[PDB]
């Protein structure tokens, strides 16, 4: 989920896009 | 972009800068 995606690894610029859209 | 962990509150900056204008959650 939102704060695991990128704190539990780096995550990407799309994966970090998928909060809005 | 950054290549680090954003452990909630930092996300919000890397989130502000990405989806700020459209909002996110």
Curated annotation (Swiss-Prot), chain A:
Q: What is the superkingdom listed in this entry's lineage? A: Eukaryota
Which cysteine pairs make disulfide bonds?
6-11
Q: What is this protein called?
A: Insulin A chain
State the gene name recorded for this protein: INS
């Amino acid at each position: 989920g939102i704060v695991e995606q990128c704190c539990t690894s780096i995550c990407s610029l799309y994966q970090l896009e998928n909060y809005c859209n | 972009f950054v290549n680090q962990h954003l452990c909630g509150s930092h996300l919000v900056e890397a989130l502000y800068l990405v989806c700020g204008e459209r909002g996110f959650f």
